[PDB]
Every structure is written in structure tokens, then in C-alpha cells.
Amino acid sequence: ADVEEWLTHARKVTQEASIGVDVTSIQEC
Amino acid sequence: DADRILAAQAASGNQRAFGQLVARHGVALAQAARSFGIPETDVDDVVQDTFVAAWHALDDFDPDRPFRAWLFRIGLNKMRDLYRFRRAARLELARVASTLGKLDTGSREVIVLTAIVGMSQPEAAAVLGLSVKAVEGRIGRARAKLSALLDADS
Ligand SMILES: [Cl-]
Predict the structure, then answer these.
(1) Do residues B92 and A6 touch, judged by C-beta distance below 8 A?
(2) Which residues, in sequence order, are CB contacts of B72 under 8 Å at separation 6+?
(3) Which of A25, A2, A19 is closest to B49 using CA atoms?
(4) CATH of the domain at B4
(5) B124 C-alpha to center of ligand 1: Å?
(6) Is residue B105 located within the same domain as residue B136?
(7) Cβ distance of A18 and B151 shorter than 8 Å
(8) Which CATH number do you get for residue B140?
(9) Any idea which residues the entry calls the DNA-binding region (chain B)?
(10) What is the domain extent for residue B153?
């Protein structure tokens, strides 16, 4: 299989899912 | 190195500088957590706990040292405690995690650090406490395993 292409896909999927990180609540600590 | 300057300021008490490190590195920490199949109910918490620990440990950190590798050593240890118990799209996310989840632990961690967050082999080796040659070996094994898994699932 084209592992490289899949890993590029995996990177994109996980990143798009992780855009909503909350810096504010971390600062609240 | 922007991180070195920010880390030094954070270590000296500057919470705004620390906030910029969170902005720069938070997405990649959450990406790793998700790659390891940690439930969405726990991802934000792990990421928060990792940064809170990093803040409190900055007193024992030489700011000339690479910040991301140090941060990920904290993060990965917290993730390891959780990922053993991993359970629209995102049916897409579930598929990524389940495929990576079939890799043995050592090769899963190396492929997530290098191919997903984007660390160099020496940086990943530093996070994992491995020789760079060990990392290169595990990457080879991981790619071979993924290729088979993808061949069998297509
Ligand atoms: Cl490399």
C-alpha cells in the first residue's frame, strides 16, 4: 500500500479534529 | 529558536509567553492523543494536564533545551496511562485510530511522533529515550505493518 499517502491523510484527519484547542482554560490554571 | 525565548520567559514567570507555547504546541499534543485513540471525553483533559505539569516543572527546565521534546515526554507518559483503554465522520478518525492501534506499542509511538506530529528521528528518539538507530528500525517495522494492514482492508 501507499503508506505515505495514508499517513498524510491521517495527519490531516487528526489535525482537523484538533483545531479547537482551548488555551484560555489552560491559562485559567 | 522562538520556543527557546518563549520558554525562558515562561520559566521566569511570564504566563503570556507560556500561553504562546500552548498556542504553538497544543494542536500537535491533541493530534497525538487522538492518534492513540484516547476518547474525546479525555483528550482535552490530557492536553490540559500536560501543560499544567509543564508550567509547574519549568523551574527544573534549562530553557536552552528543546522545548517540544521535553513537553512531549510529559504528554506521552500521561497518554500511555489512558490509551490502553481506547474505545460521523469522524468515522474517519475512528478508522485512523483503529489502524494505528493494530501496530505494536513501540512502533505506534514512533510513527505518531514522526509521521503525525512531524518530529525528526533524533527528536522522537529523545522523547522516547531510544537510540536514533532504534527509532529508524521501529519506523521501518511500522511502515511495513501499515502497508499490510492497508493491503488487507482496501
Ligand atoms: Cl529525520
Answers:
(1) no
(2) B29, B32, B113, B117, B119, B127
(3) A25
(4) 1.10.1740.10
(5) 9
(6) yes
(7) no
(8) 1.10.10.10
(9) 121-140
(10) 88-154
Q: Please state, in angstroms and rounded to a whole number, the distance separating the CA atoms of residues B73 and B75.
A: 5
Burial class (CB in 10 A: 0-12, 13-18, 19+), B10: buried
Mutate to test the interface with B, among A12, A14, A19, A27 (most CBs of B within 10 A): A14
For residue B63, give every residue at least 6 positions away whose Cβ sits within 8 Å of its Cβ, in sequence order, or none: B4, B7, B8, B11
- Is B50:B27 a contact under the CB 8 Å cutoff? no
Q: Provide, for chain B, the percentages of residues in helix, strand and coil under a 3-state DSSP scheme, each rounded to the nearest 5.
A: 80, 0, 20
Dist. CA B122 → ligand 1 center (Å): 6
Grid coordinates representing B20? 504562546
**Residue A27 to chain B, least CA–CA distance (Å):** 7
Asked if B52 and A29 come within 8 Å (Cβ–Cβ), the reply is: yes
Technique behind the model = X-ray
- Dihedral-angle region of residue A13 (phi above 0 means left; psi in -120 to 50 means alpha; beta otherwise): alpha
